[PDB]
């Protein structure tokens, strides 16, 4: 079933082998600008059922990693247009993953050199990636954030809305909202990072308010069948847990998302260091509540993907590190060929080496 077609909102994927969103930190600074090298990398992977791009800033304030691209400036839009054109010339489909990093950021890359923003003024207690004076990736402790004022929230929603308009002009087929992995939307969702006492904190209805406002805004801006969302609502991701009622709160959010008729729900099931697997009973509860495509991710093998797709519990799988290393992952999985070995030392930063130099089966 991995190599059978799937309707994903407004587009049709020819197979269920998707490229997960992968931050690679190779954009130009100043300007957070995508490059022709990035275009080549994505073009190489155009046989994917769907490419989901690296996380991309909705605004300058959204930036948390040096080398991550934006989709807010004219120069960024022009560069992304070239990248999507190359994917489409090879008959691929590409979604842009949009983020605001919130507290997973550093003052030195924020507007004005000021503290980054979040739901509450609590440090993430982790690291982000900056660049040194020679342009090389380095890890730095996160800056303690400032809590957003209530009157600043509409601007955040508008920044998501505008980035989606920009994505449409840039030629993306779909947008994926990053509501996972401890970034800004997840910072509001989780009671561990959200201690607000206004209508954006406290109850699950209040904690989900921002993400649902964003979903409504972007569905109105473009179309519901162009919108996907990534969540990581069970377990701990980048020091952000999901609170003491994680299953119930996840099912609440999913039931609300379903009302908007969005294209897909993408679940990041565990982080790279691992965690408890999803139960089939939980997967069935998610199916009961969501009527679009469900994508699973997190250390999947083709065997596990086939098992869960065959069981009718998910529709597609997003592979991360296997897609870094195998531009033709679809053909390799379909033919049961060996995969290229991974070189994790070049996942972040640098240039062509460890990026565009992983070969296909045939030249
Ligand atoms: C180098 C690297 C960068 C990542 N960047 C992102 C990202 O930009 N957005 C996101 O939602 N997840 C990100 N992730 C998670 C992946 O999308 C994916 O869920 C994970 O790699 C799946 O596990 P796998 O690599 O075992 O297939 C990243 C993972 C890696 C290894």
From TrEMBL:
Domain of life of the source = Bacteria
User: Cellular component GO terms, alphabetically?
Assistant: cytosol
Give the UniProt keywords, A-Z. Flavoprotein, FMN, Nucleotide-binding, Oxidoreductase
Question: Any stretches that span the bilayer, and where are they?
Answer: none
Q: Is the keyword Flavoprotein in the record?
A: yes
Which coenzyme or cofactor does it need?
FMN
Which intervals hold domain NADH:flavin oxidoreductase/NADH oxidase N-terminal?
Answer: 1-340
Q: What positions does the entry give for FMNH2 binding?
A: 21, 23, 55, 97, 230, 299, 320-321
Positions that bind FMN: 21, 23, 55, 97, 181, 230, 299, 320-321
Q: Which GO terms describe its molecular function?
A: FMN binding; oxidoreductase activity, acting on the CH-CH group of donors, NAD or NADP as acceptor
**PANTHER family, alphabetically?**
NADH OXIDOREDUCTASE-RELATED (PTHR22893), NADPH DEHYDROGENASE 2-RELATED (PTHR22893:SF91)
NCBIfam families under this entry?
PRK10605.1
The UniProt entry's sequence similarity note says: Belongs to the NADH:flavin oxidoreductase/NADH oxidase family.
Designated name of the protein: Pentaerythritol tetranitrate reductase
> Source organism lineage?
Bacteria, Pseudomonadati, Pseudomonadota, Gammaproteobacteria, Enterobacterales
